Design a protein around this nucleic acid. Structure first.
Ligand SMILES: *[PH](O)(O)OCCCOc1cccc2c(OCCCOP(=O)(O)OCCCOc3cccc4c(O)cccc34)cccc12
Ligand SMILES: *[PH](O)(O)OCCCOc1cccc2c(OCCCOP(=O)(O)OCCCOc3cccc4c(O)cccc34)cccc12
Ligand SMILES: *C[C@@](*)(O)[C@H](CCCNC(N)=[NH2+])NC(=O)[C@@H]1CCCN1C(=O)[C@H](N)Cc1ccccc1
Ligand SMILES: *[C@@H]1O[C@H](CO)[C@@H](O[C@@H]2O[C@H](CO)[C@@H](O)[C@H](O)[C@H]2NC(C)=O)[C@H](O)[C@H]1NC(C)=O
Ligand SMILES: [K+]
Ligand SMILES: [K+]
Lengths: 26, 252
DNA sequence: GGTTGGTGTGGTTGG
DNA sequence: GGTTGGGGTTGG
């Protein structure tokens, strides 16, 4: 339901410093 | 975690520290998947070859932690185990196949900014996300260098490797219930999971629905961060039917 | 302060 | 039988 979304990131429209690197490798 | 770096606060809210009561020491990582269910590696609980056989009575889970040692006041929650469910087909003699276990908490943990469950994948997710070269993220409080002990949670980003390469890499026999991940020797960048990091999640963020899925569990690996060597991870999806069956039976 | 209070030296816990 | 008793919370 709520799973997968971070109170301090996804839910605040902010990304972590390195998660782009994960998204770029698709 | 070798070649990692400090987690940002609330970067990995599903991370769970598995702690033995006496002598008080860290054992493993784990991951929150509901409010009552924590997913770990089996060998964290039952490895006869090392005389390792723990009871619900023996351990604590600590949820929402950042510092390895200190007790986070108003941050961390501490759960008691009600029931370990080690995989019935878990083989500790051969090659740690099906290195997985489900733990039910005595009492539901209340979510916060620091505590939040990760998602488990389905056919579609596993299918579109488990291709080689695609990178995931491993987290833990394990050893920095092969022989470690950071004072804060560590993160490394590692690419899925293709099964042919996994095979040639180790004398240990592989099954389908495992994937290997890590950097090839020419790939310039490095990093790996290590001792103390088992049970910890291998997560990937979905480009479709913008969610974090737990695709793996730090399981095993010869050394930490050797060239031509790759860490191995329990294939969370391939065991999901069991995970679901268990939770469906002893939850509701 | 901090990812958090408040005499509590620490404390269920470092500096 | 087996890393284990009589499909299964589970392969063969
Ligand atoms: P690591 O090696 O950095 O830690 C070594 C020990 C350092 O100890 C402390 C550092 C910082 C704060 C505190 C502390 O803070 C709680 C009190 C907040 O202020 P107050 O109202 O108690 O006192 C007013 C200010 C006092 O300032 C100083 C007091 C003593 C020494 C110094 C100093 O050498 C430089 C600047 C200011 C002060 C409580 C306990 C320890 C530490
Ligand atoms: P994968 O491809 O490896 O599958 C291989 C199949 C092996 O399956 C079994 C092997 C051993 C035992 C059993 C089994 O045992 C049940 C308990 C014994 O009770 P029973 O009444 O079934 O025993 C009857 C004994 C007679 O032996 C045979 C019976 C049937 C078939 C065969 C056969 O094909 C060859 C030799 C003997 C027998 C249950 C299920 C599977 C297996
Ligand atoms: C229990 C976990 O902390 C740990 C994680 C391994 C980290 N390695 C890498 N590179 N990702 N697992 C182990 O130490 C497991 C438990 C038992 C032995 N083991 C190993 O990984 C051995 N080094 C290799 C092995 C031995 C027996 C069966 C399978 C693998
Ligand atoms: C690990 O330990 C447990 C309990 O300590 C063993 O479980 C068996 O069942 C009960 C617990 O309800 C114990 O009192 C018995 O001593 C055990 N009986 C048997 C079948 O020998 C379990 O066997 C241990 N696992 C190992 C060492 O493989
Ligand atoms: K303090
Ligand atoms: K059987």
């Amino acid at each position: 339901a709520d799973c997968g979304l971070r109170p301090l990131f996804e839910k605040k429209s902010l990304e972590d410093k390195t998660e782009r690197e994960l998204l770029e490798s698709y | 975690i070798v070649e990692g770096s400090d987690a940002e606060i609330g970067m990995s809210p599903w991370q769970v520290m598995l702690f033995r009561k006496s002598p008080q020491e860290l054992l493993c990582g784990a991951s929150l998947i509901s409010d009552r269910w924590v997913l770990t590696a089996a060998h964290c609980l039952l490895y006869p070859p090392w005389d390792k056989n723990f009871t619900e009575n023996d351990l604590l889970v600590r949820i929402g932690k950042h510092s390895r040692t200190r007790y986070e006041r108003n941050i961390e929650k501490i759960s008691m185990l009600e029931k370990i469910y080690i995989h019935p087909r878990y083989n500790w003699r051969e090659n740690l196949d099906r290195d997985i276990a489900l733990m039910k908490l005595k009492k539901p943990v209340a979510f916060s900014d620091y505590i939040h469950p990760v998602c488990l994948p389905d056919r579609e997710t596993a299918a579109s996300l488990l291709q080689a070269g695609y990178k995931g993220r491993v987290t833990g409080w394990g050893n920095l260098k092969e022989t470690g002990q950071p004072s804060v949670l560590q993160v490394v980003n590692l690419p899925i490797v293709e099964r042919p390469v996994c095979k040639d890499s180790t004398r240990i026999r592989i099954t389908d219930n495992m994937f290997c991940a890590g950097y090839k020797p020419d790939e310039g960048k490095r990093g790996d999971a290590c001792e103390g990091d088992s049970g910890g999640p291998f997560v990937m963020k979905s480009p479709f629905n913008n969610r974090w899925y737990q695709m793996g569990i730090v399981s095993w690996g010869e050394g930490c961060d050797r060239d031509g060597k790759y860490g191995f991870y329990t294939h969370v999806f391939r065991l999901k039917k069991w995970i679901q069956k268990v939770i469906d039976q002893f939850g509701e």
